[PDB]
Design a protein around this ligand. Structure first.
Ligand SMILES: CC(C)C[C@H](CNC(=O)Cc1c[nH]c2ccccc12)Cc1ccc2c(c1C(=O)O)OCO2
Ligand SMILES: CC(C)C[C@H](CNC(=O)Cc1c[nH]c2ccccc12)Cc1ccc2c(c1C(=O)O)OCO2
Lengths: 148, 148
């Protein structure tokens, strides 16, 4: 499980927030995009895989799972693309709860940022630093233990 | 040492590539921006600090060092902003060499990507995965050892 990530797309202010969650740690990366297209998802995955050792991605929906551009990016970056079907039904609740939590943080900082994208990055920061360990600490520890 | 990053701005195709290098490992994150402004640099730092434990940033030039927006982002994210003066003159050579290396990789992939930003992210990927260890492996190991 150190290489497993889950995609998650949520909506706010008529805009789209694309999230990748490292399942074992709760660590996230996120971006605001005008709309969830295969192209945007593919580009997001290329960025992610250059930054962390992404082995497997559970895609957020069937359109992205089918997308030729997403498939191309997964091929390029050496990522195994899988479905995101919650065979364990606690999987959707966890993601649902994270989206609510992220939106709450966005509301708390929204005043400090002119643009939503900035607020989202503040939320990523707060989420990954929140402490017992933080998600940032957990992902580093998990990956370091795997490398050895 | 584990928390020290250096900013680096290089140019290609009439565009600007902003790079953050984790000094101890050689690990990088990068983005294409239309121009180096304080605003763009500030946003880039907010993203970086949400993703890695950034303690100190050596800024790439005096404009960014002076920028009130950059100072605001460093305050927000708990980053100590420092100059990027190469007191050890081997510092410039290393960065110079990395920019040449990154541009070479961009040329090698440029054909596989319609847009420069995509080529840059491919270059980040190749740079961080290149093997002995990779930069990705070194940064994780360095930070994990520090956490303990
Ligand atoms: C570090 C943070 C505390 C401040 C900076 C600067 N912003 C302000 O001073 C607040 C502000 C300016 N007008 C407003 C209007 C309404 C509410 C708040 C504001 C945030 C920032 C940094 C870089 C960026 C940004 C932003 C952003 O504001 O979205 O947008 C893209 O590149
Ligand atoms: C994963 C990679 C091997 C392919 C994809 C798709 N690109 C192609 O099929 C090549 C291609 C299409 N027109 C061209 C014109 C000239 C040269 C190459 C091409 C790259 C990609 C993914 C996501 C994105 C992108 C890009 C991008 O091309 O920049 O732009 C922003 O979001």
């Amino acid at each position: 499980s150190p290489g497993i990530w889950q995609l998650d797309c949520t909506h706010l202010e008529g805009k789209v927030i694309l999230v990748a969650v490292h399942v074992a740690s709760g660590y996230i990366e996120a971006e605001v995009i005008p709309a969830e297209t295969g192209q945007e998802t593919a580009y997001f995955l290329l960025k992610l895989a250059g930054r962390w050792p992404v082995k497997t991605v559970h895609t957020d929906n069937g359109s992205n799972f089918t997308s030729t551009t997403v498939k191309a990016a997964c091929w390029w970056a050496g990522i195994k693309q899988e479905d995101g079907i919650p065979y364990n039904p606690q999987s959707q609740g966890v993601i649902e709860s994270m989206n609510k939590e992220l939106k709450k943080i966005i509301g708390q900082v929204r005043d400090q940022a002119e643009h939503l994208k900035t607020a989202v990055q503040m939320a990523v920061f707060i989420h990954n630093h929140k402490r017992g360990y933080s998600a940032g600490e957990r992902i580093v520890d998990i990956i370091a233990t795997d490398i050895q």
